[PDB]
Amino acid sequence: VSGLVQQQNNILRALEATQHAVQALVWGVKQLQARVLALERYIK
Amino acid sequence: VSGLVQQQNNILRALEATQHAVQALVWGVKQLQARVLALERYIK
Amino acid sequence: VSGLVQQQNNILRALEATQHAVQALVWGVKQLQARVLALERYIK
């Protein structure tokens, strides 16, 4: 690619990489939520 | 819409979706940080 | 600056800021994983 097409393509690839990283953060936060809830339930 | 406006709107919608997920994750991490700190303060 | 170069520079500055935010949150979730693991290991 080249020109505007290369510039748009770089932006889209970087968005896709950020999207994959965000999806993994969502599931790391939900796995934490479950481990923290288990600790809270145990202490109670 | 089509052509460059369609392509630029697809990029802006994807960037906005990623920004919204980061703002929801910032709140979920603040809530987990407070819950983890309360567990650590109880245990100590 | 104006036209397409202004629109593209605005998208690039916003995408860069979102990528920085996601990398900070990847480290913050790993810090909370370590804290939660310490709590689990002690309780066990």
Can you tell me about this structure?
Three copies of one chain form a homotrimer. Helices cover 93% and strands 0% of the residues of chain A. By secondary structure, the first copy, chain A, is mainly α. Chains A and C meet through helix 1 of A and helix 1 of C.
Work out the oligomeric state of the chains in this entry: homotrimer
β-strand percent of chain A reads under 5%
Number of separate helices of chain A: 1
Structural class of chain A: mainly alpha
PDB class: viral protein
Keywords: hiv-1, gp41, viral protein
Assembly: trimeric
Entry title: X-ray crystal structure of an engineered N-terminal HIV-1 GP41 trimer with enhanced stability and potency
List keywords for this structure.
mainly alpha, Single alpha-helices involved in coiled-coils or other helix-helix interfaces, 44 residues, homotrimer, 93% helix, 1 helix
In short:
Three copies of one chain form a homotrimer. By secondary structure, chain A is an all-alpha fold.
List the helices and strands and how they pair.
The structure is a homotrimer of 44-residue chains.
Chain A: H1 3-43
PDB class: viral protein
Keywords: hiv-1, gp41, viral protein
Assembly: trimeric
